[PDB]
Amino acid sequence: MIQSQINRNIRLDLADAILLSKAKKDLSFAEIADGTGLAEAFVTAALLGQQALPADAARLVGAKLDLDEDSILLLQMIPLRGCIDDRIPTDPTMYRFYEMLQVYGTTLKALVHEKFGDGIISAINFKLDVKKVADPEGGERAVITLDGKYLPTKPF
Amino acid sequence: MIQSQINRNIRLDLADAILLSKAKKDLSFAEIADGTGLAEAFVTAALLGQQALPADAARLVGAKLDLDEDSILLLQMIPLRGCIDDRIPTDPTMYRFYEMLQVYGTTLKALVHEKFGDGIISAINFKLDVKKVADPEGGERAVITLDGKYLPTKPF
Amino acid sequence: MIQSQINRNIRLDLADAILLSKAKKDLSFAEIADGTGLAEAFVTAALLGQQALPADAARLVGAKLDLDEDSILLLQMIPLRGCIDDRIPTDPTMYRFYEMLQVYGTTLKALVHEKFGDGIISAINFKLDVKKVADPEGGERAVITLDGKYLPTKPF
Amino acid sequence: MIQSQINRNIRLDLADAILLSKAKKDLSFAEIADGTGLAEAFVTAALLGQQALPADAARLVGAKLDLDEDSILLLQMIPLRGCIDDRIPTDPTMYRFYEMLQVYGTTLKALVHEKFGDGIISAINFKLDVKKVADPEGGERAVITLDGKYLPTKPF
Amino acid sequence: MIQSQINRNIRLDLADAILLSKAKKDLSFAEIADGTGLAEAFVTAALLGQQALPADAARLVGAKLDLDEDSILLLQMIPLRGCIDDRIPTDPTMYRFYEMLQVYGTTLKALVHEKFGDGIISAINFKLDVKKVADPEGGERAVITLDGKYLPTKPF
Amino acid sequence: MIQSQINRNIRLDLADAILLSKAKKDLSFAEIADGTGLAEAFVTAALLGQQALPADAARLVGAKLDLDEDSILLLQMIPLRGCIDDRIPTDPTMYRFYEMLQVYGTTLKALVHEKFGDGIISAINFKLDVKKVADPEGGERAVITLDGKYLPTKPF
Amino acid sequence: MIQSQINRNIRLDLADAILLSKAKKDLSFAEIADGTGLAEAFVTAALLGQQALPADAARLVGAKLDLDEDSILLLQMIPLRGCIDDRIPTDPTMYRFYEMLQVYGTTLKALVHEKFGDGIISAINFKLDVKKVADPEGGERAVITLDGKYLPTKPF
Amino acid sequence: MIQSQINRNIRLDLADAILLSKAKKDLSFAEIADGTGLAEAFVTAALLGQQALPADAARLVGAKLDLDEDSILLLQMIPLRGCIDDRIPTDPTMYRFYEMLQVYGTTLKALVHEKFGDGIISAINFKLDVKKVADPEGGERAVITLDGKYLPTKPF
Amino acid sequence: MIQSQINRNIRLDLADAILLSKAKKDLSFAEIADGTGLAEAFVTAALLGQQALPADAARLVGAKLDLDEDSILLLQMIPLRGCIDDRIPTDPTMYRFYEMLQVYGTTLKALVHEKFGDGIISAINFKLDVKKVADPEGGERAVITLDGKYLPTKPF
Amino acid sequence: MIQSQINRNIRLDLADAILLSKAKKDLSFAEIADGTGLAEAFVTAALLGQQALPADAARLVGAKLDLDEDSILLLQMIPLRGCIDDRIPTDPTMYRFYEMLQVYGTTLKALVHEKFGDGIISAINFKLDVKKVADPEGGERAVITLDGKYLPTKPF
Numbered sequence A, B, C, D, E, F, G, H, I, J: 001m002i003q004s005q006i007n008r009n010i011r012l013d014l015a016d017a018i019l020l021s022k023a024k025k026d027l028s029f030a031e032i033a034d035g036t037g038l039a040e041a042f043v044t045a046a047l048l049g050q051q052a053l054p055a056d057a058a059r060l061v062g063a064k065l066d067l068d069e070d071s072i073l074l075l076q077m078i079p080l081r082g083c084i085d086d087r088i089p090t091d092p093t094m095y096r097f098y099e100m101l102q103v104y105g106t107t108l109k110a111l112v113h114e115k116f117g118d119g120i121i122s123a124i125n126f127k128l129d130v131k132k133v134a135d136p137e138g139g140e141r142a143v144i145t146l147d148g149k150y151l152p153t154k155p156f
Helices: A008-024 A029-033 A040-047 A055-065 A069-074 A092-115 B008-024 B029-033 B040-047 B055-065 B069-074 B092-115 C008-024 C029-033 C040-047 C055-065 C069-074 C092-115 D008-024 D029-033 D040-047 D055-065 D069-074 D092-115 E008-024 E029-033 E040-047 E055-065 E069-074 E092-115 F008-025 F029-033 F040-047 F055-065 F069-074 F092-115 G008-024 G029-033 G040-047 G055-065 G069-076 G092-115 H008-024 H029-033 H040-047 H055-065 H069-076 H092-115 I008-024 I029-033 I040-047 I055-065 I069-074 I092-115 J008-024 J029-033 J040-047 J055-065 J069-074 J092-115
Strands: A119-134 A140-152 B119-134 B140-152 C119-134 C140-152 D119-134 D140-152 E119-134 E140-152 F119-134 F140-152 G119-134 G140-152 H119-134 H140-152 I119-134 I140-152 J119-134 J140-152
Touching: A008 A055, A008 A069, A029 A040, A029 A055, A029 B092, A040 A055, A040 A119, A040 B092, A055 A069, A069 I008, A092 A119, A092 B029, A092 B040, A092 B092, A092 B119, A092 B140, A092 D092, A119 B092, A119 B140, A119 J119, A119 J140, A140 B092, A140 B119, A140 J119, B008 B055, B008 B069, B008 J069, B029 B040, B029 B055, B040 B055, B040 B119, B055 B069, B069 D008, B092 B119, B092 I092, B119 C119, B119 C140, B140 C119, C008 C040, C008 C055, C008 C069, C029 C040, C029 C055, C029 D092, C040 C055, C040 C119, C040 D092, C055 C069, C092 C119, C092 D029, C092 D040, C092 D092, C092 D119, C092 D140, C092 F092, C119 D092, C119 D140, C140 D092, C140 D119, D008 D055, D008 D069, D029 D040, D029 D055, D040 D055, D040 D119, D055 D069, D092 D119, D119 E119, D119 E140, D140 E119, E008 E055, E008 E069, E029 E040, E029 E055, E029 F092, E040 E055, E040 E119, E040 F092, E055 E069, E092 E119, E092 F029, E092 F040, E092 F092, E092 F119, E092 F140, E092 H092, E119 F092, E119 F140, E140 F092, E140 F119, F008 F055, F008 F069, F029 F040, F029 F055, F040 F055, F040 F119, F055 F069, F069 H008, F092 F119, F119 G119, F119 G140, F140 G119, G008 G055, G008 G069, G008 I069, G029 G040, G029 G055, G029 H092, G040 G055, G040 G119, G040 H092, G055 G069, G092 G119, G092 H029, G092 H040, G092 H092, G092 H119, G092 H140, G092 J092, G119 H092, G119 H140, G140 H092, G140 H119, H008 H055, H008 H069, H029 H040, H029 H055, H040 H055, H040 H119, H055 H069, H069 J008, H092 H119, H119 I119, H119 I140, H140 I119, I008 I055, I008 I069, I029 I040, I029 I055, I029 J092, I040 I055, I040 I119, I040 J092, I055 I069, I092 I119, I092 J029, I092 J040, I092 J092, I092 J119, I092 J140, I119 J092, I119 J140, I140 J092, I140 J119, J008 J055, J008 J069, J029 J040, J029 J055, J040 J055, J040 J119, J055 J069, J092 J119
Parallel strands: none
Antiparallel strands: A119 A140, A140 B140, B119 B140, C119 C140, C140 D140, D119 D140, E119 E140, E140 F140, F119 F140, G119 G140, G140 H140, H119 H140, I119 I140, I140 J140, J119 J140
């Protein structure tokens, strides 16, 4: 796939139409991803304009959501990524993950360098998943797993 | 603890001093946290100005790092939290965690609302840990676990 | 329930239409919320794009305001919250509540840590109400009650 | 009093020194304000650079805290108000009160105009207090009362 | 009037239409405000989205400018105030009044506190008027009067 | 005077020292400007770093405040003007004058063009004064006069 | 002219339409301004939304460009000035004039105060022109002349 | 010269020192540059941190201003250029040159492309000068000449 | 070519249309640029709104992509350059080139001044090339060549 | 190396000290890096706070520059990277490399996705080289090579 986007608004406008059709059809993201062979977080991210779907998956989710052919094609383009409106989220749900960075950002840096060395944990060679577990004290918790490759920074 | 800070620079300046002592002594954060009864991410965050240590742990890390009494006292104060200089990290290691929000922030929202409902995953009733593992294709990966309680939003 | 929004413009445009219909019909927010079983601040926030109405409430307010069926569905979706255009309000009425934070924000932090300990007062597990009272010196006063759960930060 | 400040850093530096002395002495804000004739929120705000204390209270708290003569005079100066470092708080405890504005700011405007008319709720003719209560579901809640005069805007 | 706006663009779009009609009809703001019983600065501000006209005035200016009924109703709505596009004006004419704040802002604070005490000069209980006078050395000057109530900040 | 500044911090630091001296000596700005032949708003502005005092005035005020010779010379330098820390004031007293621009900025433009023509009201060929007057409904008001030359924009 | 604009987008949208028509007709700005009696920089700035054309000049360029009556009227309105999208230009050609400010801004201030005194060089009583000349080393140079009246700031 | 700076504060601190010494010695920029063979705008800019002086010029002006040897060396380093504190000047004198860009920036672009073609007017191969001329209507004008090489953008 | 744009949205909107047509016809940028005589980086940049195509090339690519005549003319127009939505890219692919500047920006400055002297490497007299090479360690690398003319800064 | 920094000011203050010593000793970056076995761009970036030197290289450059022991240790710490003062460079030399991103940023994205596919060119597994070459038309050019590993984005 060699086609790519440069203006996020195209795929984000499409995401809005996907969300409307999904709401009208009472569909979950789990059901939309079911049968693609792709993880729900990857498929969901594509619907929301942040990943590219392979052709087969694009056609399958397109049927489910009743998308036109131009829309099924856009879903296959490599996106201009960046889902936050203006750098810092205003939405509370979305903001808590930013706050995690404000509280633990330097600790994540410190422990990455301690355990791995100079370099980065990838956001590209990277997977994430969201799991609901019972809280032994009452209620529920989310266990969100960020799984990224370590890439070293080495002299040259 | 009822004492709290309002100017992050005080504890951030102490953090720099801690990092210098730690470097001169060839200590790791795991080493410093060993024996405190507390997780390495929590103790590390406290050293870096983002948590408060209980008195016993403050005295122990203070002995390990040869910190003076004002410093051992400062570590027990509730901090003015926020480790990022100016909202968006410039450091590549830190930035990748912000990039994961730019790529998956709306997906985390979507999947939280689907699995839990309206509300948030907490950044307060919250634990995180960093694990080094083998990458099955070669090299190493970080598995970073964000473990947060779900708090619902419901009508009143 | 499980459907959510990622572009606040959709629900904010709906808010503008609701406000137009509301004005043509000479309706108050108190009137619109009457019979929903929900507090006026909660129903008002939903109309203005910041909460989700349960289905029964959406139909009741929808009938009162003569909203079409797409609008009645939108009111039930979980919003992308954030009512301020660009971080700091320009409107004097809204600004005073921001200035309240500029004057007392560190005092709120200090007293919260003194009375409760390390942690937060929730904006999620949270109730708001606005009460008009006579001023014994002449005039009227607003008594605005912010009622939020304390969630502690504890070591792990 | 007719003397005022133009650089908030002077009074905020004094606040840092006050907090250190307060912590060394194991004092609460409630104790410091005791015998002052003034509400804890007002005295605390003055200590943190956001209000001016009368000479009598400045000397009383100054003695309690061991402040030099220049500091007790500073406490009586009219401040350059503004406690937030850079417009939006990073600290989670302070941030939650900002988030209340992001979620309810337009609701507060709408309900103020409905109950009072065109105008504002004052942040000057204004009192606030923080009370700790039981949470009938378990735990504790903060009831924060914002009590502000209504000033109307009327044609001229 | 209990109806209010939350999106300034609606009234600012109306303002644009008002300005076009006013130009096609060769009307001045003084002419439009004549007969309303209201000062030219107040009526002009309402046309430009920054005040609410009483019903009688709205119908009068609506007839003078040939406004439709939706517009006459909009002019009676309480606005979301804030006429500056992005905080600092680019327009030279508007910018000069911002520059006066950059040069004299702390002087105004200093002199207000000297003459009145701790508190504010109101922008709500407030009148302004623009008068053209001769410059004794040749040309013209504008004498702009800001007339605002003093509200004291008093301890509690 | 041909000497000028490029770093506002030097004169603003001097302002801080001036305000301390003035506080210890219990002086008013009216008192300090007395005997200079200059308006209190101009002398106050100079002390706060926003105007240059002629040598005779600099020596007069410098005597009253007990300033060293380096400071009396600094006050005669042409300043790098700009009294607001970061574009928008946080202080309530100075914020109200910014709010006047958010509400009436476009009205001031519109009326200036109507009365004078294309061009500006100067902030350079400019006087301002602050006058306290009784409010017939009770209390006090500030009448603040901005008096600026009209300079037209004319085709070339 | 007493009619003015408050939303720059109206005149900037007209500029876009003017530019398309101009390119279709293979016209230069020098040709469009020919016969108006006005300098090419003034007429060009008017077309681009930053000056008001006298009526006769508006009709002349309107004929050359095939503009409709509403557009010819718009060109005569006093504009809401400000041609830069967001404060700092991104376009290399316009950025160099900003860079000229970053490099020489304080030099221009220092030399203006040295040669003229305290005060400003006007941007209002102001002419500019662009001239192409030979570079003695080969190639071409632009000689851009900023011709502004000196307005002093003197005590009052 | 192969040495360069990366932190503008070093040379800007030197500039403040230079300006105090210059003020104590009652010197003009014209006098300081006299005998260097360099234009007053180039020498002034170097003193203010925006150019590098050759060795002989640095020794000359350093003698005139009684600079230490470290300071004379600093004047010869290639600077980290950028004289504006925070992107947009607050000083009225410098702001007017920014306003010329807000009003004429697109006109400068348009006329450069018309006269020269696609490309830029250099800010590097560039000369500027400030000349005082009498205004035939009374008073003084500044004629500021920006003289830059045209560099074309050509396809490759 | 003497015609130029001032609003980037016109050419960027055309870019979006070009990308959609390019995706529908399964074309690459190398293919589109084939037979124009122009480097793929230059032609691609023109399509994406950042260069002007000569007329012959504009008609060739216009045919390949089924562009209408307004669009083929627009491609020949000198653009208002600037492809980044809001100064800092959000897209990871684009961001890495920004991170290169955050890590090596001062090194590039230092080494340019060391090897060439005071002055700049041009972004105008400039060629850009992207080549894919095999990584001896496995995988592939991009070798991106920035070839700019050195322009000296010399005293005047 | 497991030790890392969180406050860039420490290493950037050291960079300033290094640059002073380097200028006093009339050293080039090429000579400082000679004998380290590391590329001049790597060693230079380390001196400027953006890379960590191995211990032997730290000692060798520390000897050349006469650095104290704490400085030789600091050069070995993993930095808090980010060399740009405030996101966008002000310095002309550094700004040109940002301008290349404003002009070619979307072209680099497009061509990377065309030649390699979805994913990124690394700034971490990355080397850069600056080469001076004669310009056949006269003068000099810089050939700057960015050599980064391709990391693909693939579904999971």
